Design an enzyme around this catalytic site. Structure first.
Site, PDB file in Angstrom:
ATOM      1  N   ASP A 191     -49.478   5.514  14.291  1.00  0.00           N
ATOM      2  CA  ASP A 191     -49.299   5.860  15.718  1.00  0.00           C
ATOM      3  C   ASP A 191     -50.454   5.352  16.578  1.00  0.00           C
ATOM      4  O   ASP A 191     -51.206   6.128  17.150  1.00  0.00           O
ATOM      5  CB  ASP A 191     -49.135   7.377  15.900  1.00  0.00           C
ATOM      6  CG  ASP A 191     -48.649   7.768  17.320  1.00  0.00           C
ATOM      7  OD1 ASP A 191     -48.059   6.939  18.068  1.00  0.00           O
ATOM      8  OD2 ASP A 191     -48.876   8.938  17.667  1.00  0.00           O
ATOM      9  N   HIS A 233     -58.096  31.432  30.489  1.00  0.00           N
ATOM     10  CA  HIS A 233     -57.151  30.822  29.572  1.00  0.00           C
ATOM     11  C   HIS A 233     -57.151  29.302  29.767  1.00  0.00           C
ATOM     12  O   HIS A 233     -57.734  28.794  30.717  1.00  0.00           O
ATOM     13  CB  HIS A 233     -55.744  31.372  29.836  1.00  0.00           C
ATOM     14  CG  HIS A 233     -55.307  31.207  31.252  1.00  0.00           C
ATOM     15  ND1 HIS A 233     -54.700  30.062  31.723  1.00  0.00           N
ATOM     16  CD2 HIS A 233     -55.444  32.027  32.316  1.00  0.00           C
ATOM     17  CE1 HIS A 233     -54.475  30.190  33.020  1.00  0.00           C
ATOM     18  NE2 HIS A 233     -54.908  31.377  33.398  1.00  0.00           N
ATOM     19  N   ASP A 239     -52.003  37.791  35.697  1.00  0.00           N
ATOM     20  CA  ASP A 239     -53.023  36.735  35.601  1.00  0.00           C
ATOM     21  C   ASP A 239     -54.223  36.967  36.529  1.00  0.00           C
ATOM     22  O   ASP A 239     -55.366  36.892  36.073  1.00  0.00           O
ATOM     23  CB  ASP A 239     -52.388  35.376  35.921  1.00  0.00           C
ATOM     24  CG  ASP A 239     -53.284  34.193  35.587  1.00  0.00           C
ATOM     25  OD1 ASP A 239     -53.980  34.193  34.542  1.00  0.00           O
ATOM     26  OD2 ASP A 239     -53.262  33.219  36.375  1.00  0.00           O
ATOM     27  N   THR A 263     -51.128  27.350  33.886  1.00  0.00           N
ATOM     28  CA  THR A 263     -49.875  27.737  34.538  1.00  0.00           C
ATOM     29  C   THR A 263     -48.901  26.586  34.736  1.00  0.00           C
ATOM     30  O   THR A 263     -47.786  26.632  34.210  1.00  0.00           O
ATOM     31  CB  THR A 263     -50.160  28.422  35.897  1.00  0.00           C
ATOM     32  OG1 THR A 263     -50.955  29.582  35.657  1.00  0.00           O
ATOM     33  CG2 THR A 263     -48.884  28.872  36.601  1.00  0.00           C
TER      34      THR A 263
HETATM   35 CA   LIG Z   1     -46.235   5.264  18.133  1.00  0.00          CA
HETATM   36 ZN   LIG Z   2     -50.317  30.845  34.551  1.00  0.00          ZN
HETATM   37 ZN   LIG Z   3     -54.826  31.734  35.624  1.00  0.00          ZN
END
Ligand SMILES: [Ca+2]
Ligand SMILES: [Zn+2]
Ligand SMILES: [Zn+2]
Ligand SMILES: *[C@@H]1O[C@H](CO)[C@@H](O[C@@H]2O[C@H](CO)[C@@H](O[C@@H]3O[C@H](CO[C@H]4O[C@H](CO[C@H]5O[C@H](CO)[C@@H](O)[C@H](O)[C@@H]5O)[C@@H](O)[C@H](O[C@H]5O[C@H](CO)[C@@H](O)[C@H](O)[C@@H]5O[C@H]5O[C@H](CO)[C@@H](O)[C@H](O)[C@@H]5O)[C@@H]4O)[C@@H](O)[C@H](O[C@H]4O[C@H](CO)[C@@H](O)[C@H](O)[C@@H]4O)[C@@H]3O)[C@H](O)[C@H]2NC(C)=O)[C@H](O)[C@H]1NC(C)=O
Ligand SMILES: C[C@H](CCCN1CCN(C(=O)OCc2cc(Cl)cc(Cl)c2)CC1)[C@H]1CC[C@H]2[C@@H]3[C@@H](O)C[C@@H]4C[C@H](O)CC[C@]4(C)[C@H]3CC[C@]12C
Ligand code: NA
Length: 775
Positions: free
Chosen positions: A655, A409, A256, A154
């Protein structure tokens, strides 16, 4: 001491004095009569027939008195029940060609209606379950789904919406997190989350306020019911021109909470979705009441989806590690691993990784050091992201040990059960328009466009969602090239080279189908033409920044001859000074080499010899060469066959500081032993062809189709648990996991692609932000 006439005021009072705003409850600072005055419940939130034209009673929650309309404080159904209106839902779509606002409204207002845990496929239930949402969706502008940011929780996703930023940039890297410079922890429940220090970037309401646009209060205390939040917004909209906000937010905790209890596919979900819809219809009936239902931009947006997750699908780290009491784990749909006590001395990350890697056959999580997470997650450049990370499989949990709900989730943002919603409805949005999926990081820009605001620097690609809008306040401008290329001729003899190497035209127009990539930093580099491929050779990095070539559907794959196995040829157009040499590769016992243009796709035996030039050569681990060779020899052909040919731009990435941005020289930390040949952290490829697959790649009238990846350049294939099997079992699975957007590569390389096409530049920006996911 009293809130009279001050209920839901749009400011903070103090310094000692009591508050009456929508946040005072969370801050334990409401006046004594806030509850009594500002949160009246009497008689529900809906007018009834026999209440019409009533005695005005000030204890009522909302009103059905004849004066109510003057004061913006009727119930949302007042005119439906009393003055014989129809609900907004029971009216036809009518196109809003311009914003119909009352006099004084200097811009169309924006209301963001955010729903927590709203899975994209919940929209299949339709007007049978959600009539109001199904109207917004159908009449307005909608996407099949919207991709959240990882982790699909969230607070990272809500604050990504607010700022345009990846969680690693805005700082809210999870619902729970530890910061080693603060020596403090942030949780959903706690007072620490009220410190401003945890929240970076610039959320929409700050960008609004800093540019003189009035920001409707953006957080809601949980003790304030939904019907009341909706009436408070309507009441704020009725305020005078000089006091009225132009941007508002509503947030729903559903579906949710229900989603967790009963799973996403439980029949119980129906009542929460009906509830959200009725909330939506109170907003739309209230807007219609105020004559703003064709003035207001409404955004119906979700933060993430929801998956089937039960407690019997848990992995315990105590089956893999021995001293589990020496670590702290952030559990659930992701893992983040740290020492328990920083004073440990013999706490070794390397040992932990080894122990968690490819142990069980059915293993439902994978360990990573954060810098080796797929770059598409952009989840590494924050001191709150623990070095050890666990990517957990969909439908599974991870816990520390067995002595530590049907839905959850947090998984990888490409997972289909994590996809969520976007609808835009109102004047500025288009009418009955489907648009392709996109990433929630893009919306901050759109919301700034809708409010005439200049966005703060963010990770959206500004202009990439112009096709959502009837009227664009922003036309994207292609950036200026910084370093112009050299085209050096034959300038050195073959005897002028001792690099320790042994061996024994319509090029531009068929190998750069979409123009030459522009270099957006200061550097010196050479363009090099060959029959089969064209490259931009860096004289600083001693290798190509990019290498571009095209393969037809009908083109031949040949093998590398055995007499040219170790063939590397010195390149006459580049000085020995600015060339790699084959000696360092001997001296370097771990490093070998590969080629960017594949010798496996040479058009002829004679042409093949250009593939073995020193200026097509790149440092590669033997482990990585298994991945790379299988791509070149098999998959590049495979993709050409299936897509009616393909263009391919391959190159390195550096990187080392894992910020998703091109390293400077100063920031390179590994070289081939005893040399200044820098070692890439990743290798990219951008593979383009005609979307209209009937037409071949080099003769594409219509739109373009792209896929890309950023393969991490690693000395082992421990990421791939089937790596000891033949490459056809695992390589294409490895690649798909590290799928990427063209835009990601441009950040990482400082180049700009697709500069010479027949397509509009805003359409190219969509193509550059597109992510192939393989779902
Ligand atoms: Ca970089
Ligand atoms: Zn959420
Ligand atoms: Zn949740
Ligand atoms: C996604 O988009 C963002 C934004 O475009 C990209 O990140 C940005 O990256 C820039 C280049 O690396 C960083 O610049 C550096 O900033 C240093 C100063 O940092 C402070 O000020 C920053 C400026 O803020 C302005 O913009 C925001 C926009 O939202 C506004 O809110 C402000 O009002 C300002 O107008 C600010 O962003 C920084 O915030 C960071 O730190 C604080 C804590 O101190 C956190 O609260 C934030 O969450 C944020 O943390 C992130 O960023 C830092 C790096 O700054 C990381 O270390 C963290 O891990 C985390 O990711 C600060 O308050 C400059 O001093 C620095 O100068 C260097 O380079 C110059 C030459 O250019 C040299 O002269 C110097 O010697 C020096 O080496 C540099 O300019 C931005 O901070 C950063 N912005 C944000 C919002 O993250 C990001 O790359 C994009 N991602 C991709 C993949 O493309
Ligand atoms: C995290 C704190 C509240 C937790 C409960 N909330 C339930 C309701 N809610 C919500 O209304 O969401 C709206 C929404 C929609 C979108 Cl699309 C995006 C977002 Cl980000 C939100 C969702 C959650 C809140 C309560 C008070 C908040 C702080 C402020 O008092 C002061 C600061 C203001 C700055 O602009 C940002 C930082 C800071 C400290 C606020 C951070 C969040 C706080 C603590
Ligand atoms: Na070697």
């Amino acid at each position: 001491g009293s809130c009279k006439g001050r209920c839901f005021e749009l400011q903070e009072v103090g310094p000692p004095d009591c508050r009456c705003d929508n946040l005072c409850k969370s801050y334990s600072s409401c006046c004594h009569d806030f509850d009594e005055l500002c949160l009246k419940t009497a008689r529900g939130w809906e007018c009834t027939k026999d209440r019409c034209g009533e005695v005005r009673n000030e204890e009522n929650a909302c009103h059905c008195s004849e004066d109510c309309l003057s004061r913006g404080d009727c119930c949302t159904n007042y005119q439906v029940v009393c003055k014989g209106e129809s609900h907004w839902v029971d009216d036809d779509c009518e196109e809003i060609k311009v914003p119909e606002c009352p006099a004084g409204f200097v811009r169309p207002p924006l209301i963001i209606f955010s729903v927590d845990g709203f899975r994209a496929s919940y929209m299949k239930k339709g007007s049978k379950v959600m009539p109001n949402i199904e109207k917004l969706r159908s009449c307005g502008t909608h996407a099949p789904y919207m991709r959240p940011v990882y982790p699909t929780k969230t607070f990272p996703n809500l604050y990504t919406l607010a700022t345009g930023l990846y969680p690693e940039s805005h700082g809210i890297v999870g619902n729970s997190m530890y910061d080693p410079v603060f020596d403090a922890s942030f949780h959903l429940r706690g007072r620490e989350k009220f410190n401003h220090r945890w929240w970076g970037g610039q959320p929409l309401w700050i960008t609004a306020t800093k540019q003189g646009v009035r920001a409707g209060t953006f957080f809601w205390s949980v003790s304030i019911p939904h019907e009341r939040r909706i009436l408070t917004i309507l009441q704020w909209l009725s305020l005078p021109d000089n006091e009225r906000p132009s941007v508002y937010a509503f947030y729903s905790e559903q579906p949710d909470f229900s989603g967790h209890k009963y799973g996403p596919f439980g029949p119980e979900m129906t009542n929460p979705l009906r509830e959200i819809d009725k909330t939506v219809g109170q907003l739309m009936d209230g807007l219609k009441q105020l004559r703003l239902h064709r003035c207001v931009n409404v955004i119906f947006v979700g933060d993430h989806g929801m998956e089937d997750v039960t407690c019997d699908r848990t992995e315990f780290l105590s089956n893999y590690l021995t001293n589990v009491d020496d670590i702290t784990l952030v559990p659930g749909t992701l893992g983040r691993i740290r020492a328990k006590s920083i004073n440990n001395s013999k706490y070794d990350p390397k040992t932990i990784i080894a122990a968690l890697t490819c142990k069980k056959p059915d293993q439902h999580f994978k360990p990573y050091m954060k810098q080796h997470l797929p770059k598409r997650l952009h989840y590494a450049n924050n001191r709150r992201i623990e070095d050890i990370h666990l990517l957990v499989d969909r439908r599974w949990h991870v816990a520390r040990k067995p002595l530590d709900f049907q839905g959850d989730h947090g998984f990888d943002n490409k997972v289909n059960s994590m996809q969520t919603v976007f609808v835009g409805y109102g004047p500025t949005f288009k009418y009955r328009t489907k648009v392709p999926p996109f990433e929630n990081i893009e919306l901050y820009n759109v919301m700034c466009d809708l409010l005439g605001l200049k966005p703060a620097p963010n990770n959206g690609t500004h202009g990439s969602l112009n096709h959502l809008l009837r009227t664009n306040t922003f036309r994207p401008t292609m950036p200026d090239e910084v370093s112009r290329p050299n085209y050096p001729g034959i300038m050195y003899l073959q005897s002028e080279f001792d690099l320790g190497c042994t061996c024994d035209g319509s090029t531009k127009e068929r190998h750069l189908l979409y123009g030459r990539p522009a270099v957006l930093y200061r550097t010196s580099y050479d363009i090099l033409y060959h029959t089969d491929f064209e490259s931009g050779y860096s004289e600083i990095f001693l290798m190509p920044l990019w290498t571009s070539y095209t393969i037809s559907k009908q083109a031949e794959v040949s093998s590398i001859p055995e007499h040219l196995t170790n063939c590397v040829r010195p390149d006459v157009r580049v000085s020995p000074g600015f060339s790699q040499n084959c000696l360092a590769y001997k001296n370097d016992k771990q490093m070998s080499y590969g080629f960017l243009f594949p010798p496996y796709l040479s058009s002829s035996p004679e042409a093949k010899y250009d593939a073995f030039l020193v200026t097509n050569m790149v440092p590669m681990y033997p482990a990585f060469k298994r991945v790379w060779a299988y791509f070149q020899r098999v998959l590049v052909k495979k993709y050409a066959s299936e897509r009616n040919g393909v263009n391919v731009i391959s190159g390195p990435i550096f990187d080392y500081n894992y910020d998703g941005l091109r390293d400077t020289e100063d920031e390179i930390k590994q070289y081939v032993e005893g040399s200044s040949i820098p070692v890439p952290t990743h290798y990219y490829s951008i593979i383009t062809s005609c979307l209209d697959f009937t037409q071949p790649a080099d003769k594409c009238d219509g739109p373009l189709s792209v896929s890309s990846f950023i393969l991490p350049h690693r000395p082992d294939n421990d990421e791939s648990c089937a790596s000891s099997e033949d490459e056809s079992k695992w390589v294409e699975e490895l690649m798909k996991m590290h799928t990427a957007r063209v835009r990601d590569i441009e950040h990482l390389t400082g180049l700009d692609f697709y500069r010479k096409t027949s397509r509009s530049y805003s359409e190219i920006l969509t193509l550059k932000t597109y992510l192939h996911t393989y779902e």
